[PDB]
Design an enzyme around this catalytic site. Sequence first.
Site, PDB file in Angstrom:
ATOM      1  N   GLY A 264       0.821  -1.203   0.000  1.00 44.62           N
ATOM      2  CA  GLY A 264       0.000   0.000   0.000  1.00 44.62           C
ATOM      3  C   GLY A 264       0.863   1.264   0.000  1.00 44.62           C
ATOM      4  N   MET A 266       5.211   2.738   1.395  1.00 42.86           N
ATOM      5  CA  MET A 266       6.496   2.430   1.997  1.00 42.86           C
ATOM      6  C   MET A 266       7.134   3.697   2.548  1.00 42.86           C
ATOM      7  SD  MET A 266       8.837   0.317   2.800  1.00 42.86           S
ATOM      8  CE  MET A 266      10.223   0.834   3.810  1.00 42.86           C
ATOM      9  N   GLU A 267       7.648   3.609   3.762  1.00 43.64           N
ATOM     10  CA  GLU A 267       8.076   4.782   4.545  1.00 43.64           C
ATOM     11  C   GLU A 267       9.512   5.190   4.231  1.00 43.64           C
ATOM     12  OE1 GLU A 267       8.915   1.129   7.338  1.00 43.64           O
ATOM     13  OE2 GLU A 267       7.389   1.651   5.821  1.00 43.64           O
ATOM     14  N   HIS A 298       0.094   6.376   8.742  1.00 45.43           N
ATOM     15  CA  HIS A 298       0.929   5.196   9.068  1.00 45.43           C
ATOM     16  C   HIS A 298       2.368   5.422   8.622  1.00 45.43           C
ATOM     17  CE1 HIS A 298       1.402   0.690   9.372  1.00 45.43           C
ATOM     18  NE2 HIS A 298       2.443   1.000   8.584  1.00 45.43           N
ATOM     19  N   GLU A 299       2.526   5.796   7.361  1.00 43.34           N
ATOM     20  CA  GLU A 299       3.878   6.080   6.844  1.00 43.34           C
ATOM     21  C   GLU A 299       4.527   7.211   7.622  1.00 43.34           C
ATOM     22  OE1 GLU A 299       2.572   3.112   4.899  1.00 43.34           O
ATOM     23  OE2 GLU A 299       4.669   3.543   5.034  1.00 43.34           O
ATOM     24  N   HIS A 302       5.920   6.072  10.922  1.00 41.83           N
ATOM     25  CA  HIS A 302       7.204   5.394  10.705  1.00 41.83           C
ATOM     26  C   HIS A 302       8.371   6.357  10.671  1.00 41.83           C
ATOM     27  CE1 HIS A 302       6.256   1.184   9.951  1.00 41.83           C
ATOM     28  NE2 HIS A 302       5.515   1.395   8.845  1.00 41.83           N
TER      29      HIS A 302
HETATM   30 ZN    ZN Z   1       4.173   0.073   8.183  1.00 45.81          ZN
END
Ligand code: ZN
Length: 859
Positions: A264, A266-267, A298-299, A302
């Site tokens: 979905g 990536m950080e 969410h990212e 992180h």
């Molecule tokens: Zn994650």
Amino acid sequence: ALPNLTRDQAVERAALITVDSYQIILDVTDGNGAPGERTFRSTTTVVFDALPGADTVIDISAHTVRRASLNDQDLDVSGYDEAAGIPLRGLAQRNVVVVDADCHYSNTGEGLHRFVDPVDGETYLYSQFETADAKRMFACFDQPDLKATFDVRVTAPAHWKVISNGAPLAAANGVHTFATTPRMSTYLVALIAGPYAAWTDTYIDDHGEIPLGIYCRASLAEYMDAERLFTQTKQGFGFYHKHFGLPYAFGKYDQLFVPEFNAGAMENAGAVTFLEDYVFRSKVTRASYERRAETVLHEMAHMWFGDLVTMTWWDDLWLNESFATFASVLCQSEATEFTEAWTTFATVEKSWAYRQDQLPSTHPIAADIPDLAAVEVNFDGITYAKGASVLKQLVAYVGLERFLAGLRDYFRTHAFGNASFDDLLAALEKASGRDLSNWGEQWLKTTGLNTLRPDFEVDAEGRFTRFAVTQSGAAPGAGETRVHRLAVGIYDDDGSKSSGKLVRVHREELDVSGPITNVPALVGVSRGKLILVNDDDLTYCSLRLDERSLQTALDRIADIAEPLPRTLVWSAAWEMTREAELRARDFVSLVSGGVHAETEVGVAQRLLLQAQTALGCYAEPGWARERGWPQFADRLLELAREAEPGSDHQLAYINSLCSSVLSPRHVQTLGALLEGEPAACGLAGLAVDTDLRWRIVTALATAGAIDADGPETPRIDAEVQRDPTAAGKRHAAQARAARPQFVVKDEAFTTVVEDDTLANATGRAMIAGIAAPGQGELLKPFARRYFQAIPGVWARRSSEVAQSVVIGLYPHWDISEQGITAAEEFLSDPEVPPALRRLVLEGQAAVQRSLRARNFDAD
Ligand SMILES: [Zn+2]
Ligand SMILES: [Mg+2]
Ligand SMILES: [Mg+2]
């Protein structure tokens, strides 16, 4: 094949070397100013200290290594093999290694991925390295506890944008340079390059300014809603800065929607990549906006949990993913318009946690990960959703203030460094002023669920004379009871001289421990009509209801006023269905009759997917074909026709109709929506737009209604002419494979399991079409072909890419004792590698659950 780095190898290497800096020099041209097509040049300089006289290995996956040097001594690379890297023998105290290579572009979403847009012929690149694919772009010690600064330079076609972690310096004569990063892990290094469209904004608070960028392919720019994304981004920074102490540490913040993404998002530090499905070309419901906002947040979480502080080794991946998940939902609830985010979490993400925790591969949150192979199948519902659920419960147990204070200490202690389980628990113990060693052992080092139930007696006026919460031992697992901070809610009528809604009329918070916890405070209290012993969803458990409360739930779910307790009831009913306690047809009845009252369209969407699993997998198949599916399809069209014009619910019901098993009437209705005004179909205000057209075309293909004369596809090809985009081509590939012709299934199956050159995103779309609903009898031959093919797919493709076939083509449709035995016979070979055995064990367990549910639904 890339090296399967072991935990032991990583510990051994980190004892020998400490890295200072990388300089990465990339040339992604063809040497004549145009985009490269097959390889790119990568020239890496790494500076590191070592135990003098030791040996190590630098990792690199390259088409050609042109040269390599240790302290300006040329190395013999004539026998180079990516499995072995480049050995570095007889290290000095202080070292410089240079590796000059030609690396291959990827079309499978690992390494430096290359895509060509069919609309405009433009080339786009992006990197994806978690877990250990950085070595496909630059030579490195590819493990997360060997942090370093990164100084990136890229030579690219003149018209391109080039984005990396660091802020750009002015580009000159094709050459783009970037600010040196803070110390960070190799898996977070980023490169995104091509003629991406850009949007800019700035986040400003007392800590300073964060320049914000959003990027997507030129051909998708018209669909971008950058203001809404920037609003959510700024809400996130405000929340994280308010609570986490140290402000964002990585400079600027770019968010890039990229083609053919495997996950979905990536950080990558300063350069977060996203699935470009989140650039909505067509009308989507609030569920999609809410899920995208959760992903943004969410990212961003992180940037603390993974980028500032990183786990030492992959056994502590939960330090990144459990905390990012928990923090993102907390932030969404408190800082954004998605104020029901905890309701969505209890229905969508906790259901994933339960499913993962009940599989035979169940593992603690703090996992045992001996090698990369083990972590590549561990980005799962325990590492993400169970861990977040258990952290939500830790916040209940110690309070949010002590929890956040402990994290602020943890960030300050381990900033630009690495942390393990023991470091996190030490910080939270200090802040909470108590021993959490027993709490960590029973919550983070165990598997399974405790079942929580009310146990009581009432007098003649319906008042409790005794009340307890009973707790089962953890299952599947080691059978322990746990400590919980939880609430008991009692629900009853709100009406004046009327039932009205079921509202909360009494709440008791308590400390639960052991098999039985008395609640003296409830003696003399009315039992009401519905008792929930996980009110407000504070703990991770399997919730069950007393007989009377359950009858109230099954009869009056639509009267529960507040979204969260209504979701606790939806979830208990669904879990009872999975557990062969509630018949599939009774769950379908409950959803069919109650979903009109589910105001949260994200919850409603999940209930409709559950009802479809109930019908396709859990229900007696004769009843499902003759009655359950056609009745559910008829109800979806009635629900769609009763919904408000243009509403989210109207669209959700029609989307669910498109993914159901259809009768001829439903096929006529959906085909009419492609040709005619939707008002004529009783669906005024429904936008039959690009993607809803594709969902309808895919339903008609699945039903045998279009392109059913043979393998040719004139109707689907005409839809591609209408939508000749990369997205339209993937939807077409799905629709062609969805047709109920054995020869079409066989051609698609053989292509996806054989053709290693086919883009992973196209393969996935074909697999979604192969495994279409209602086709289990047609697909029976592919069960044996799957078992015979997967060892080869697993050997030839990376774990992440092989998973498209191993997970997506598991024969979930062969719900039989023979299907169970087929997996048992595959599993009987002890040389099948553990990660492949895991995925087959999981598939077999899902089919076993389906058989037990079908036996319960029939009887
Ligand atoms: Zn994650
Ligand atoms: Mg052009
Ligand atoms: Mg990966």
